[PDB]
Symmetry: D2
Subunit: 148 residues, 4 copies
């Protein structure tokens, strides 16, 4: 079976650079990869991935998954079932601290969860877990609460 890794955290936490880190490890090992965003194939629906996935593909990499429809749950469970490893990067929470549904569903399915931190825009510590509106900023919980 393939395994699912989900990388998550606020804006500016290094999510996409983590994602393409694994992309690099797979390419180095000479595994065939397919990379998607909402060199990546820019797609509207999760059902568009099949067209860029070959019999040969052993890794599928997905960026900004919060923006995909939740049907990506089922398409990823299917790739896993076929023995394809899947890596997904996206925001866990909105700027109002509500979950992004597609990331939540993927977090439930994940074999491995990576939570990434950012530098806090207000206090400067490497301890920021949240995204705050106004342009977007990454902040820790305490700073989020004092800023609104």
């Amino acid at each position: 079976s393939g395994k699912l890794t989900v990388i998550t955290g606020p804006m500016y936490s290094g999510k996409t650079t983590e994602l393409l880190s694994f992309v690099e490890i797979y390419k180095l090992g000479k595994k065939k990869v397919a990379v998607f965003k909402p060199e990546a194939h820019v797609i509207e629906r999760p059902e568009e991935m099949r067209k860029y996935i070959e019999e040969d593909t052993r890794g599928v990499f997905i960026d900004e998954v919060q923006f995909f429809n939740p049907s990506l749950f089922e398409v990823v469970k299917d790739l896993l079932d076929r023995g394809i490893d899947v890596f997904c990067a996206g925001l866990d929470l909105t700027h109002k601290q509500n979950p992004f549904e597609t990331t939540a569903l993927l977090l439930s399915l994940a074999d491995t969860v990576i939570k990434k931190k950012a530098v806090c825009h207000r206090c400067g510590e490497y301890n920021a877990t949240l995204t705050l509106k106004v342009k977007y900023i990454a902040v820790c919980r305490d700073c989020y609460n004092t800023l609104k």
Copy 2:
């Protein structure tokens, strides 16, 4: 502020014994804790209020799958008040669908711990799913890897 740790995985993955690892650290430290299951046995997340005091430094909640998704805001508020929260629950049902309350708390978590069980079928330390099977020997629930889930279920 408080930080949220979420322990999850399939049945028989040791998630309760794990959250007790955490209760104990706090007791050893002479800290006041409040422990909940669906340890006080409550029905609604809004009932935690009654058992949490001004010097409660840690909140521990088991079987989180069985609570209403309002637990998300209950926990968010505890974190903002500086109280550390530890939650254990199942991530997926025997049909491999997400439990909503667990999925919400994983989005909010500072730290996620994914637990594995022993695969009931192939024997390896690698089971991530729960499956309902015929219960003639010991309907029953078993923990399986994905390969074995697909073979059996």
Copy 3:
């Protein structure tokens, strides 16, 4: 091949309990385990030397659990490796650093071998925060800032 998991942290960081959390999952799963501790599966076999483990391991044994590894001879590194090569999962708990913040060598060597590392924290004795990573001095668990205020 077997997998190595190492749990480390200061005193009072719940390392022993985490180790039993792993024993019990093998037990529920009907796997045969062997549990060891050093001379300072329901029995913890108290043994002096890492080479003494072989006498309690049957062809059948699928997981090996070792507590307080800092007190074992560093030969534990080769004995654990052999166990991995024979398809047996090993889980080890111990202190990473002495009360003087020097590495415990055996725990150090096991960390380089580990497939998985779990770093555990205690409640800070001075501080009250869930952030102690160090042991001090009675022994007391403390965060790095309080360790420096106290000594």
Copy 4:
């Protein structure tokens, strides 16, 4: 105080880019950082040479290929943590004969966080390589493949 993160694994498991990724997060957050090897990056022979490149401003220090530094790096890193500086180190945990690299082992002891990286196994093509093997070239392999090839 600062916190120590140690990134480890076999060759081609992506340690260097993992470390640089943490550099980028810091640089974007407008923290002053310094990088070292056996935002300015310095090549240094001894760990004690970091001292002259750390300013009162410096909030992150990033150190690569740590298996080649003297074990004295442990106490240099301890001092930096004690002065409020965060430290990220990346280096090989095991040599190609599966003996510990001493310097990494000690930093693993000091670490607050440990990241173990995996490579794709050169022999069986899986994402499960934890070991390095001299074959002269070096390759990454799982334990099972290592023992199959020697």
